[PDB]
Symmetry: C3
Subunit: 364 residues, 3 copies
């Protein structure tokens, strides 16, 4: 019988708290300082209520459908309300309950990334309707595909902490939203700060254990965020003549997003190069609300492609799987992106249409 | 010789930091956004200074008198300044020093819950006087009774993380206070957020170890808070036509309070039902400063009663003690509530009277 | 082969996150509420960008030059980009990578303490230039001397968590700066709160392990901060007739600074006495931006001297080294202070002069 390691339990519970902290209040405060002042209270309210909702859907069927025995695309409905999960059931080296909470917390930040951006111009019941649809039909299957031993995992896709699952996923759902004035920067700074601190639970907890890989993912997190800040600020300086607080924060986020899939597979060299490239591509991206999805999306993609590179032992990475060339890993990452982009697309489109046809989309 | 487990040490120290974070700045910021703007600075000051004071009383005699060898009601004065506690002394599976800090942190949030609410209309030296009296004569004996193997423990009272010790206790002391405009909701949101994040140290650290029970209490924490938010917001929507940010936050707190005694004894089913019922009863409660004590009090009681139910193996709980019916456990919880309510009553009354007769109660 | 303990890994990673949290956003928010409103955005920006920079210099050569095989004053350039540090390399009882991050995080808060104070009246490129110079030529050698088995360590200097390395060091660099209106106190309160919470990672993580010494340093942290608050507030009350929020926060910081070198070597008795003395000396100090350095400096020195005392087994301490009198330990602490003060002096002076002669110091 697999036996739980209390060091890992402790690490994973604390990491889960940190990920929770990313949404409550990190992303809430982040947008809070960015959206028009008359909309903050309502936005803060829609994030909190949809967070609650995402927590509940998860314990009811979310976890089971994402992580239960299933097919290439979804699990089962045989862990409803966590039935048939023994309290002492182990998963990896931790109790399965901690796996339930940790993964659930990722589902939350994904949703809050979308709700925060779209709370301004969406009717409440519409967003609620949306959350249900998209969590169930996009976050869950994609989570199953990447981390639940579904299609993408069984093809060897390297995505440590959710470049596709959290980032590209939410970014698409958000931009379909868009398709269908910064008043408190200190508050934006604060939310960003909290996102960065939580993000350590996020990337490092993704090791499932307090080992050398969690150590690697942690260090790399520091490195990429730092690299991205400077790459962004230098870009901002070169373009605009000077850094701004918003540029600085945005850079942090570019690097964090960009390193998300890679943190556990790459060397600090890899971490730094990925940070710089993510900062600049982010900055390039916003140049070419809604912007957030250009950062998550662009930097999400850039990270996933570059994982397919810096995982190489050659470049200081942990190495690709046996018999996997860097060429092949690159095809694989590209295919995972293409799926994520397309899957989230159809589902969000469906999400908004159902809402639109049920309650109407734009605020009364 | 009992030997300390470094995984538990680590978990418990981090949990202690989280509980500390609940008071500094969680509760301070919570009230900060709620009380009149002209009173915030002074309130923030009275919380910080009484926090310091509670830390000091605890190391001087508080811990020993709450957790030392004693009678049914109080310990001893043989751990003054932690004398006769070996640095390597173990308690449970952690070093006793970590037990000192963790428990001390619970004493703090209890006090800060009261000071925050009453800083507006109480003279400083009066509140100080009060803190000394009530910490010494109410928090300590009740802590001894529930967790120090006193009267209530030796009768089998289920109270995992302080439904009686923290909640009903403070709520009564506060309402006796009362008996004798929300200007920054983002700040209220922020404090609430911090309280929720710390609350994981609070409920889960109450396992004393990073085991499956800490896992259970953590998951349940997420579940109950979520359930409570929705139960509250739906009530608010049904009554008032729409949710508010304050309702949302309040719901979070209803669930957190409501699950406090139960988190370690109940199934996720139990967690959810307790959350919903606590959200609604909270909302019902505030309907029928000062409100905070209606939430802590009502939801404190509701949690303690419902623990006496959902602990049953029958309902997905960990099970009652051997030879204990659910009927008997219900009598026991009810008696613990009745004691807590009454004990805190007399003591707070005494607290305020001494202050009143020494320095006067209302601000000069 | 030395083998990594996952409990310690977990503790140390979480402690590193907490220390990071001290700078992002703790110190940023602290100053944010203190400096003129027109300067906050730019200050927040200079802290974030110099944080990024300090993270990068550290991974490139900082860590190796501070902690590599070297002389009495500096390490080597044989861990460039962490080359020749095996991913599984162990240090103490944790993976060396966690040692890289943890120590790196101390470098950050040191820098942010200076940048925060001087962002108002220094040109950006000047501060940047400065950071590079002073981190490389002062923080690093002093870190090597105290913690990297250099001059000061090999003479038996007791400095648990950086009374000299972080505090006196930064305080001097800052006051040389000076030598060459509080608008949001709630924000000051918030930053202070975050600094205190992070500070537990800071003092306790300095054990390198979740053991009884980390337990001791944690408890003492609570004790000294509490003692300092009251010692300060009582001083403020005695002098000014009443406490202020700023006094309360400042006291917290006096105690935290004052206990920094001592937390791991002294009894709770020692902790309390050191807190009180640090609160008062801090308050005395500010009486006799820029003030911050009077608190860090004075309380830094007071802590380092008093460590040389309360480490004694006689006074409840862990005891001095074999064959070391308390007299001798006192000479040693005094010499460490004198070196730190003088070393940081010359280096900061050089830092500002280079900047001045390159880009100019005062804002255009």
């Amino acid at each position: 019988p697999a036996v739980a390691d209390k060091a890992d339990n402790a690490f994973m519970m604390i990491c889960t708290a940190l990920v929770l902290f990313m949404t409550i209040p990190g992303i809430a405060l982040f947008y809070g300082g960015l959206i028009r002042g008359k909309n903050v209270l309502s936005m803060l309210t829609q994030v909190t209520v949809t967070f609650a909702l995402v927590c509940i859907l998860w314990v009811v069927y979310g976890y089971s459908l994402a992580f239960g025995e299933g097919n290439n695309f979804f699990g089962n409905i045989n862990w409803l309300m966590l039935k048939n999960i023994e309290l002492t059931a182990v998963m990896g080296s931790i109790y399965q309950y901690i796996h339930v909470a940790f993964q659930g917390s990722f589902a939350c930040i994904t949703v809050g990334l979308i709700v925060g951006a779209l709370a301004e111009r969406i009717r409440f019941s519409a967003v609620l309707i949306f959350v249900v649809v998209w969590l169930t039909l996009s976050y869950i299957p994609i989570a199953h595909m990447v981390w639940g031993g579904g299609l993408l995992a069984s093809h060897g896709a390297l995505d440590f902490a959710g470049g596709t699952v959290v980032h590209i996923n939410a970014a698409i759902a958000g931009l379909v939203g868009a398709y269908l004035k910064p008043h408190n920067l200190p508050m934006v700074f604060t939310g960003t700060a909290i996102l960065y601190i939580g993000w350590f639970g996020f990337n490092a907890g993704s090791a499932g254990t307090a080992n050398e890989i969690a150590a690697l993912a942690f260090v790399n997190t520091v490195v990429a965020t730092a690299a991205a800040i400077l790459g962004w600020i230098f870009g901002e300086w070169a373009l605009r003549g000077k850094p701004s607080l918003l540029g600085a924060c945005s850079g942090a986020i570019a690097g964090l997003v960009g390193v998300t899939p890679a943190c556990g597979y790459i060397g600090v060299g890899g971490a730094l190069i990925i940070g710089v490239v993510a900062g600049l591509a982010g900055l390039w991206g916003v140049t070419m609300p809604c912007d957030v999805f250009g950062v998550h999306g662009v930097c999400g993609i850039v990270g996933c492609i570059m994982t397919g590179i810096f995982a190489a032992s050659s470049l200081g990475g942990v190495g690709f799987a046996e018999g996997v060339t860097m060429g092949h890993q690159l095809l694989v990452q590209l295919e995972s992106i293409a799926i994520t982009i397309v899957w989230s697309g159809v589902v969000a489109f469906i999400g908004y249409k159902l809402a639109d046809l049920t309650v109407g989309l734009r605020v009364p």
